[PDB]
Amino acid sequence: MNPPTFSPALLVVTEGDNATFTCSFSNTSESFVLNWYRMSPSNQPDKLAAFPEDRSQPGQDSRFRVTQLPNGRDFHMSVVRARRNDSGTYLCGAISLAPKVQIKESLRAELRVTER
Ligand SMILES: [Cl-]
Ligand SMILES: [Cl-]
């Protein structure tokens, strides 16, 4: 497995707007999960959303969405109604579920949410 890529490296939006990063990941045949994390400011990496949508736990209402685009390689990681407090760093992490369980992370990207 190759690590995903996460773009753009810097996204600047105005408070109230949506913000969308693109995670690109080219899978093996094998099952995988793609997690979107907020990395700072941090307690630890905080998982925001995942692909596939998690069915191991009850659903959770969220401003954060991960969608697979019809090309299958690209995924949108979106925030709705971005707040100043959403400013920080983010990454996407691919988890291979077979044959060996491993996680490979993208480089970080920064979200800057500016005052209206
Ligand atoms: Cl990257
Ligand atoms: Cl899904």
If DSSP states are collapsed to H, E and C, what string results for 91-104? EEEEEECCCCCEEE
Share of the chain residues as helix, strand and coil, in percent rounded to the nearest 5 = 5, 50, 45
Tokens 């209402």, residue located: 61
Among all ligands shown, which has an atom nearest to the Cα of 7?
A: 1
Q: What was the resolution (in A) of this experimentally determined structure?
A: 1.4
Is the preceding omega at residue 3 within 30 degrees of 0, hence cis?
no
Å from CA of 39 to ligand 1 middle: 14
- Whether the CA torsion 94, 24, 56, 110 is positive or negative: it is positive
Q: Are 52 and 97 in contact (CB under 8 A)?
A: no
Domain boundaries, the chain: 1-116
Å from CA of 58 to ligand 1 middle: 30
Fold topology of 1-116: Immunoglobulin-like (2.60.40)
